[PDB]
Design a protein around this ligand. Structure first.
Ligand code: MG
Ligand code: MG
Ligand code: MG
Ligand code: MG
Ligand code: MG
Ligand code: MG
Ligand code: MG
Ligand code: MG
Ligand code: MG
Ligand code: MG
Ligand code: MG
Ligand code: MG
Ligand code: MG
Ligand code: MG
Ligand code: MG
Ligand code: MG
Ligand code: MG
Ligand code: MG
Ligand code: MG
Ligand code: MG
Ligand code: MG
Ligand code: ZN
Lengths: 249, 38, 160, 119, 196
RNA sequence: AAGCUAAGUUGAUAAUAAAUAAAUAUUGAAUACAUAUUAAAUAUGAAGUUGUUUUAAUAAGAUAAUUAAUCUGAUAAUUUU
RNA sequence: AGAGUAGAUAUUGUAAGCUAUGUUUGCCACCUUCGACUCAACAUUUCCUCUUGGUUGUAAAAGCUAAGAAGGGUU
RNA sequence: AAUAUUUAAAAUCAAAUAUAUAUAUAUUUGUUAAUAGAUAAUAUACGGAUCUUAAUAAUAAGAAUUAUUUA
RNA sequence: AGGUAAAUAAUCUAAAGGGAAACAGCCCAGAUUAAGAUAUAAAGUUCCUAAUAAAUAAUAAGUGAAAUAAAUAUUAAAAU
């Protein structure tokens, strides 16, 4: 009845011993990490306008981050995925735009075809929100601090003056044909090569930018927007993550 | 501490110790007599 | 005349277990022993032009012997190319990062011949800090050895 | 000293064994030379080869250089020699007044058994 | 050797046992080794406490006169001989602790230099010239008590642990030479400098 | 006016934690004393180290769909985020 | 040796002794551009910042001297 | 145990060889170690890996350093 | 001084081969053309890399492991 198999004595008679835990494991990394105790929500940077404090009279530039159809699609767990995170989805998209596979995924998770999806990593299993629920601006409290991730404005192929604040050469006094140049780019022969990471002209902007400890000036569920003190990376209609500030409480 | 190659005990109250692969001379009376071998 | 026949068994890649808990060799000597196996020098059919070396599964690698104070002194180096980026890690630190198996692998790599087959040979080495491993089922075995092993242990191994 | 003559200050075990073997060979050569002379002298007196080989009283060599080589005070055997004189020459300009024999040029051919009494 | 040869006296209430460990550990030196197998215990009135000890050492319990001896398999072995004098001394200290108890008086010296039991004995608050509050938790086994504010007493079964704790307490402010001022553990002295 | 900009605006100088350096100790032999140990045990300790934080790269893993009246991409057009 | 109110070794350290460095001025002859601007990378023999030993010459505060330390900074 | 030198086979003793030979004479050989001192600039730099062993327990490892040797 | 000036010997010069990591001059050894069984030289024999097993001591410092760094200091060890 049983299948034929041979087993080595060396592997059978080996005394059982558990492996020691390693730093470059997922679970150790998770333990190390500095993470927020609560989920976040995806937003769109609609624009920017003044916020007048009515008690003091102080004016503060505030960016208006709109919150539309923001929904916990699913979430990830340490036993399956190696970490705790809430996959949030923002907005509504047409059928036409979304891939068949993505549409099926959304149907399985029981949400509308979504405009932008993103994870929000958390410390514990307690931080996970039940899936399918709708996240509104009232999630955040007025006066609380939040970290803000988004892709910055694209600046194109920039020079070393704009990239790195290089002083450049003089305007007059003989200076020929190199007024905005980086000057020397190395050393005669010992290096015999431009060493890695030498600040040179290149593409700038259109990279992710976390902005830490920004104050939530105002929250209102009526207009579907979170007011946030100061600037946020990227153009108008750019997607903006918002989670509680790890540094500030 | 007088960090030096030569490490002799000065007074009777000085005592030599061997720690961390270095000869130390501590002293119970005079604190100036503290020495270390390199 | 000697060469003529069925050569398939000669060039067969066997799988060699080594329970490091049982083995009494130090790290480097063990690595050197492994290297030969990985190359295929042990087998008489060997030729330098042909890779014909066996698999080596190392297990219970946490109990590997290291003499002197090498565990807290011996430094493993690394360098990208950009100056001021020399990464020097002590043996214990390397172990904490990855394991004792990583350490063994490095030794074995250094033992091996420096050419296009080296990487392949290194890949064939399968090291494990503790006991449990997927290759348990594929180590070379014989029917005459089966009486030594108790009845239910074999079944448990097969299940695993 | 920009050019690198990478010669070690001391010899390996295998080098030392080879040196010892070489020393032994020169002693053997000397022994053979004395023995052959003795045999020849026995033959001249009127014995057979075998009889000469058997002979109790072996004849010592009359020529000067051979006689000197036979003397251990002048030319010692490898078994007689000190450990130091096998592997270290006298060099007055070196510290310790000593230098490895392997540092001598053509040390494999050139013989040098006897060092000074206190150097 | 001269220490380890000295026999230990025991009173009927105290029992010095010995037995093998559950999982013996081996200390590996450069050339020599040292396998910790046995585990001596000193049970008594005030408490009980143990010493993990090498294999080469073993007791010699005598019924008559309450004496026990300690010996090693090779006294001419240097490491063993060094261990022998240590272990005997350790078990003597344990005996002393279980029967009598070890003590460590800290006297505070200075204007507003004093100790206080803050967490019902579980945290010795120490005020010794600092804006920030200073102190540390008492370990298990250690019992602290304060007859005066400026005179604290630490008490325990382990001579090692109590005197370590006392040293830690002192470390906040050791005695200054100019004014005999700080925290003095037991009979501690300091040569006072001339004022000038 | 838009845009772009700094003279302008907003934020950050990335914790907690772990092991250490010099240095400071506990018990304690070898060596009747002494000795923080170049002995066994037990503790402190740095703008440094490990990390943490941030960016870029990679893609283990995960959800879903699976020869298609509208599967997934590209070529094409209108464009700019 | 000698200064250091006293005490060579807190701090100082003649002339002579033993080394390291390849930062100066030379010597050799294998080998036929100083400064400014711009951007700097590396070292540590540390100037500042952090930790610490000594300082009848650390009361305090400023110092002096020594050990660890190249993270950040250094018109 | 303590004090103070020396680190030596010249003397001395021991061992071996050669001449008369159970002895004498002559010759040859045998007398410390570790650490600190310790040190710059593209990057660790024994050529590299790596090398000091450990009972239970292996048909099995235990310098791959230094010194004197053997097969 | 990898300096300079000559004395003696060798090699290079004009010499390929093995060793010395790489190498004009060092250690071996002199290519007429092959063959590859046997003796080998210098140098080696854990792996990279052709080839190894032992004995007696010492080191614990990775000292050292084919390019030996000094006075002096400390700790041992022998002999008197
Ligand atoms: Mg300009
Ligand atoms: Mg112009
Ligand atoms: Mg004591
Ligand atoms: Mg003490
Ligand atoms: Mg810190
Ligand atoms: Mg004077
Ligand atoms: Mg002078
Ligand atoms: Mg120069
Ligand atoms: Mg420094
Ligand atoms: Mg002060
Ligand atoms: Mg840091
Ligand atoms: Mg003599
Ligand atoms: Mg280097
Ligand atoms: Mg080598
Ligand atoms: Mg010349
Ligand atoms: Mg010519
Ligand atoms: Mg040639
Ligand atoms: Mg010629
Ligand atoms: Mg010829
Ligand atoms: Mg080394
Ligand atoms: Mg070298
Ligand atoms: Zn003193």
């Amino acid at each position: 009845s049983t299948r034929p198999f041979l087993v080595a004595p060396s592997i059978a008679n080996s005394i059982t011993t558990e492996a020691p835990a390693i730093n470059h494991s997922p679970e150790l990394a998770n333990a190390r990490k500095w993470l927020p105790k609560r989920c976040g929500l995806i937003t769109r940077k609609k624009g920017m306008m003044p916020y007048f404090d009515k008690s003091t009279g102080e004016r503060s530039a505030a960016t208006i981050l709109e919150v539309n159809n923001v929904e916990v699609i699913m979430h990830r767990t340490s036993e399956v995925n190696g970490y705790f995170a809430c996959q949030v989805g923002y907005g509504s998209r047409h059928l036409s735009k979304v891939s068949r596979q993505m549409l099926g995924h959304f149907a399985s998770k029981v949400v509308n075809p979504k405009e932008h999806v993103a994870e929000f990593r958390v410390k514990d299993e307690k931080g996970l929100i039940p899936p399918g629920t709708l996240l509104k601006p009232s999630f955040f409290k007025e006066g609380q601090y939040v970290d803000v991730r988004s892709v910055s404005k694209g600046k194109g192929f920039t020079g070393v003056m704009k990239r790195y604040g290089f002083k450049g050469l003089r305007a007059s006094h003989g200076t020929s044909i190199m007024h905005r140049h980086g000057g020397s780019y190395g050393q005669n022969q010992d290096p015999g090569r431009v060493l890695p990471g030498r600040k040179m002209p290149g593409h700038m902007g259109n990279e992710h930018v976390t902005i830490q400890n920004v104050k939530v000036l105002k929250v209102d569920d009526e207009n579907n927007v979170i007011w946030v003190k100061g600037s946020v990376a990227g153009p108008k209609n750019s997607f903006v993550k918002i989670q509680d500030a790890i540094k500030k409480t | 501490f007088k960090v030096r190659t030569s490490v002799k005990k000065f007074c009777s109250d000085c005592y030599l110790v061997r720690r961390k692969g270095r000869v130390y001379i501590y002293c119970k009376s005079n604190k100036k007599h503290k020495q270390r071998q390199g | 005349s000697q060469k003529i026949g069925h050569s398939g068994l000669a060039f067969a890649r066997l799988w060699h277990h080594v329970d490091v808990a049982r083995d009494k060799r130090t790290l480097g000597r063990l690595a050197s022993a492994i290297a030969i196996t990985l190359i295929g020098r042990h087998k008489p059919v060997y030729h330098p032009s042909q890779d014909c070396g066996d698999y080596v599964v190392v297990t219970n690698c946490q109990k590997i012997r290291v003499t002197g104070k090498k565990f807290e002194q011996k430094t493993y180096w690394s360098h990208s190319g950009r100056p001021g980026q020399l990464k020097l890690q002590t043996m214990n630190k390397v172990v904490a990062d990855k394991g004792f198996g990583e350490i063994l692998k490095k030794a074995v790599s250094g033992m091996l011949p420096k050419n296009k087959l080296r990487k392949q040979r290194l890949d064939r080495l399968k090291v494990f800090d503790g006991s449990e491993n997927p290759y348990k089922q594929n180590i070379t075995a014989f029917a005459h050895e089966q009486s030594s092993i108790p009845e239910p242990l074999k079944e448990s191994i097969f299940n695993q | 000293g920009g050019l690198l003559w990478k010669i070690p200050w001391r010899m390996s075990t295998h080098q030392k064994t080879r040196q010892r073997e070489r020393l032994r060979n020169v002693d053997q050569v000397i022994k053979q030379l004395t023995l052959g002379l003795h045999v020849q002298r026995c033959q001249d007196k009127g014995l057979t080869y075998q009889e000469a080989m058997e002979s109790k009283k072996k004849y010592k060599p009359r020529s000067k250089s051979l006689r000197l080589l036979n003397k251990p005070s002048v030319f010692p055997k490898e078994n007689q020699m000190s450990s130091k004189d096998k592997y270290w020459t006298f060099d007055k300009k070196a510290v310790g007044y000593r230098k490895g024999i392997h540092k001598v040029p053509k040390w494999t051919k050139i013989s040098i058994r006897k060092a000074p009494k206190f150097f | 050797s001269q220490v380890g040869s000295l026999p230990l006296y025991i009173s009927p209430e105290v029992q010095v046992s010995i037995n093998a460990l559950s999982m013996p550990r081996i200390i590996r030196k450069g050339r020599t080794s040292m396998n910790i197998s046995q585990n001596i215990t000193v049970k008594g009135p005030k408490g009980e406490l143990s010493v993990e000890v090498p294999d080469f050492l073993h007791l010699d319990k005598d019924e008559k006169h309450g004496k026990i001896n300690v010996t090693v398999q090779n006294s001419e072995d240097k490491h063993q001989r060094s261990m022998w004098g240590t272990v005997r001394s350790l078990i003597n200290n344990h005996i002393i602790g279980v029967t009598e108890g070890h003590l460590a008086v800290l006297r505070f010296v200075g204007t507003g230099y004093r100790a206080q039991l803050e967490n019902d004995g579980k945290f010795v608050n120490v005020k010794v010239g600092a804006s920030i509050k200073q102190g540390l938790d008492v370990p298990e086994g250690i019992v602290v008590k304060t007859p005066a504010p400026t005179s604290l007493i630490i008490e325990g079964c382990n001579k090692q642990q109590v005197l370590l704790f006392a040293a830690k307490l002192r470390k906040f402010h050791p005695p200054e030479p100019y004014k005999g001022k700080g925290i003095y553990v037991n009979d501690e002295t300091i040569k006072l400098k001339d004022k000038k």
